């Protein structure tokens, strides 16, 4: 079980602190090739004539687009999400305004969510932005999603073994380990941290001595909170294909300033972004999805850091189509 030299190493901290990335060149190249499948931008169309708001019948989101632009978007959407299936994945063959099929309405919300990320989560996605492809990767079900319990394989394009199957109780500890970089940490950071804003990630005191009043008996957070936080960080690390020192100087995890890299602030924003999407776009879709989409407690599949990043510190190595599809945001 070993990976041969050379390793690719970077520096993310002051010399002598052994901070930085440690990359196996072959893995990087293999991920590069997978992400290289990002379809290139459709040729630019000239905006002739009326907004489709006038022209078409049931266009809510992209109503201001001229027709040519609009069909350009519809084409891009098709090759990002449902290329195998074609336009009819979401449309009634004979009535295009028809909302008959759930992919239509789900796709309508996803146009909204997508323009949300690109307009409002600028502090995370910056000027790279996302598109339907960032998550979907050419299939309607995105390959990396989370339910309210751990599931395996992480890539839902792979076929589960018996033990992996969520119904197989004997395989629980492994479903959890594969989510936390193989640790034995008995916590699921997804449901604890990313599904909603209920829990506080920070667990480390900010004073040298114990403050009288929060430091004894039931006043205290249980130590199990520090395990969870560690589990989450194992997960975030494995999700971005990186290590702690990509973000922290481990001298003082709890400190920012010189003890934290810029990417930690960005990750801080991403935790907030992921919670927004889950709480406000993705989780509600359990209303609009077939039962076959939903998990064991009737939850829609939702997003963690892997859903976009899929093992790279910038999703798709920072490829952007933002200037090519302004429909999708930022929306002034």
């Amino acid at each position: 079980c070993f990976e041969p030299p050379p390793a690719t190493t970077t520096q993310t901290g002051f010399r002598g602190l052994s901070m930085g990335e440690v990359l196996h060149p072959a893995t990087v190249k293999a991920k590069k090739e997978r992400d290289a499948q990002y379809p290139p931008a459709l040729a630019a169309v000239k905006a002739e004539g009326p907004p489709v708001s006038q022209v078409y019948k049931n266009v809510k989101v992209l109503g201001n687009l001229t027709e040519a632009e609009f069909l350009r978007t519809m084409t891009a959407i098709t090759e990002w999400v449902s290329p195998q299936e074609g336009c009819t994945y979401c449309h009634d063959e004979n009535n295009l305004a028809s909302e008959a099929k759930y992919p239509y309405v789900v796709a309508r919300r996803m146009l909204e969510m997508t323009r949300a990320i690109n307009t409002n989560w600028t502090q995370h996605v910056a000027q790279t932005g996302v598109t339907c492809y960032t998550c979907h990767r050419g299939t309607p079900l995105p390959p990396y999603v989370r339910y309210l319990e751990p599931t395996l394989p992480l890539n839902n394009r792979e076929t589960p073994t018996h033990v992996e199957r969520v119904e197989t109780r004997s395989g629980y500890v492994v479903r959890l380990a594969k989510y936390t970089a193989y640790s034995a940490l008995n916590y699921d950071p997804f449901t604890m941290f990313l599904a909603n804003d209920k829990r506080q990630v920070r667990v480390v005191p900010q004073t040298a001595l114990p403050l009288v009043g929060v430091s004894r008996g039931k006043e205290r957070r249980p130590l199990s909170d520090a395990y969870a936080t560690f589990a989450l960080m194992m997960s975030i690390s494995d999700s971005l294909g990186t290590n702690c020192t990509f973000c922290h100087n481990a001298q003082t995890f709890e400190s920012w300033g010189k003890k934290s890299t810029p990417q930690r602030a960005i990750a801080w924003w991403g935790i907030r972004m992921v919670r927004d999407l889950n709480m406000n776009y993705l989780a509600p879709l359990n209303a609009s999805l077939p039962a076959s989409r939903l998990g064991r407690q009737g939850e829609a599949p939702q997003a963690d850091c892997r859903t976009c990043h899929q093992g790279v510190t910038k999703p798709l190595f920072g490829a952007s189509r933002l200037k090519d599809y302004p429909e999708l945001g930022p929306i002034k």
Binding site: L209, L211, V212
Partner: protein, 258 residues
């Protein structure tokens, strides 16, 4: 308010850091470093033409004497004044305090440098039940060589010079620890045995090789006073004799290795 805070700036842990260090240097300097001085002290030196002092530092660095009561009777008290009365065939090579000494005779038999022994007791080391501890297998009858190992009785002993120097006649066993410690050999062309500690022996199937000394030098290996017994001091004499060969068997052995 904070748990542990004692004053403006001062807290429990910080005071304990100071106690920890104090406990450590106390045990190290005042205890352990004085236990280190139960042998060899007080330091010997040149002498002064006029001096009269119970020199203070020599008192302060010593612990109080302890006495071991010995299992088979007697006691031993350390530290104690344990001077070396024996004459040493050595001469200063140069004048200064740090100069090494040279042997002026045969260092092997003079017992100087790596050939020195300790003035151990002239007593036979005993087992727990009072018997002699280290005895030849001629005496140690209920003992044996484990099946699988060379029995050396019969084998030739071959000295550093490549020359056969004698013939192994017996093994001496430690009956307290069940462990061979010496081979005994008939010395070639002499009417004597020699013990040779097992550490100086490369045991082959066909011979026993001893590189510490040339065949010539086996003749002068220390002799025991009895034949089926050895005293603590004799063990020391025998062992030291071969050890001294490592520096002294030939002229170039004391000189630079390379």
């Amino acid at each position: 308010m904070y748990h542990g805070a004692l004053a403006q700036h001062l807290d429990i842990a910080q005071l304990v850091w100071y106690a920890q260090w104090l406990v450590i240097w106390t045990v190290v300097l005042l205890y352990l470093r004085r236990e280190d001085r139960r042998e060899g002290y007080p330091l010997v030196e040149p002498l002064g033409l006029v001096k009269l002092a119970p020199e203070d530092g020599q008192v302060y660095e010593l612990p109080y004497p302890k006495t071991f009561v010995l299992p088979h009777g007697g006691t031993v008290t350390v530290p104690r004044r344990r001077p070396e009365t024996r004459e040493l065939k050595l001469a200063q090579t140069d004048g200064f305090e740090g100069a090494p000494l040279q042997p002026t005779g045969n260092p092997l038999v003079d017992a100087v440098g790596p050939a020195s022994y300790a003035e151990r007791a002239e007593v036979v080391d005993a087992t727990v039940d009072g018997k002699a501890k280290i005895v030849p297998l001629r005496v140690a009858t209920d003992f044996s060589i484990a099946e699988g190992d060379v029995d050396p009785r019969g084998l030739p002993v071959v000295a550093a010079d490549g020359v056969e120097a004698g013939t192994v006649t017996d093994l001496w066993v430690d009956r307290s620890e069940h462990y061979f410690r010496y081979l005994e050999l008939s010395v070639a062309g002499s009417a004597r045995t020699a013990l040779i500690p097992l550490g100086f022996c490369d045991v082959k199937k066909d011979k026993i090789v001893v590189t510490s000394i040339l065949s010539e030098q086996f003749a002068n290996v220390p002799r025991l006073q009895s034949r089926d017994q050895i005293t603590l001091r004799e063990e020391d004499k025998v062992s030291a004799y071969y050890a001294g060969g490592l520096l002294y068997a030939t002229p170039e052995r004391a000189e630079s290795l390379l």
